[PDB]
Design a protein around this ligand. Structure first.
Ligand SMILES: CSc1ncc(Cl)c(Nc2ccc3c(c2)CC(=O)N3)n1
Ligand SMILES: CSc1ncc(Cl)c(Nc2ccc3c(c2)CC(=O)N3)n1
Ligand SMILES: [Cl-]
Ligand SMILES: [Cl-]
Ligand SMILES: [Cl-]
Ligand SMILES: [Cl-]
Lengths: 4, 123, 123, 4
């Protein structure tokens, strides 16, 4: 999971 | 403020291909010079400008069989159908002309672009 | 010896979400405490172990309406349905418990994992 | 396009  | 799962789109496509391989919830047959290909209308629309136009038509959206132009090569279509469900294109010297012509007819702009580039490198 | 188009899976998912937003070729309604959500069975199966099991059942595969357990929160389902079609999860302090419980019921393992991690950080 |  990432900060888009 | 959403978070994003990097592999989600790839995992979705992998599962859609698993459904195709097991013939689960396929809802259309694409006929190419008597060869038949089962697929999901939504996936075909998501990958091709031609299928997008066909299945948004108020009459064609309800067809279970679509016949492609007789000039379309079944191997070129097969390679492109595989690309639709995997992101992988089996582009070879012996098939590049049939793949490019099929991608132009199907309106798959990124495939047409890489075929034009690979042909230009060989000239 | 295939070549691969990096953005293909993301572009496919983006087009599938465009079809959902315009209600094109949706083939099921998911009922959650009287709230209704239209979707594509194949996308639901590709994202959820529960929908995968439901739509591979020889009787349930043909249903146009699926009613979820009354304990399922409609907002938690909505957030997860958005994630299915976009890879983006709107995870917030006020919804994390409902999102995790819904993801556990829907069998969306990666969502359950990030919810467990975000909850553990707050304790 | 890449070599996967
Ligand atoms: C244009 S809005 C839109 N909305 C939903 C879908 Cl399913 C869709 N597909 C589609 C349309 C055109 C093209 C492709 C897919 C691939 C390509 O090269 N051209 N388009
Ligand atoms: C297991 S083979 C397979 N073949 C096709 C599909 Cl459509 C599918 N979906 C699915 C199954 C289980 C789970 C998910 C999707 C998400 C998750 O967390 N668990 N699985
Ligand atoms: Cl028909
Ligand atoms: Cl393309
Ligand atoms: Cl029904
Ligand atoms: Cl998940």
């Amino acid at each position: 999971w990432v900060i888009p | 403020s959403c978070i994003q799962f990097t592999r989600h789109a790839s995992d979705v496509l992998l599962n859609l291909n698993r459904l195709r391989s097991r013939d689960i919830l396929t809802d259309v047959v694409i006929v190419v010079s008597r060869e038949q290909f089962r697929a999901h209308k939504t996936v075909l629309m998501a990958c091709s400008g031609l299928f997008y136009s066909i299945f948004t038509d108020q009459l064609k959206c309800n067809l279970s069989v679509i016949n492609l132009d007789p000039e379309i090569n079944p191997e070129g279509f097969c390679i492109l159908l595989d690309f639709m469900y995997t992101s992988r294109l089996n582009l070879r010297e012996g098939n590049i002309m049939a793949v490019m012509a099929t991608a132009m007819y199907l309106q798959m702009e990124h495939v047409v672009d890489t075929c034009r580039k690979f042909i230009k490198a060989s000239e």
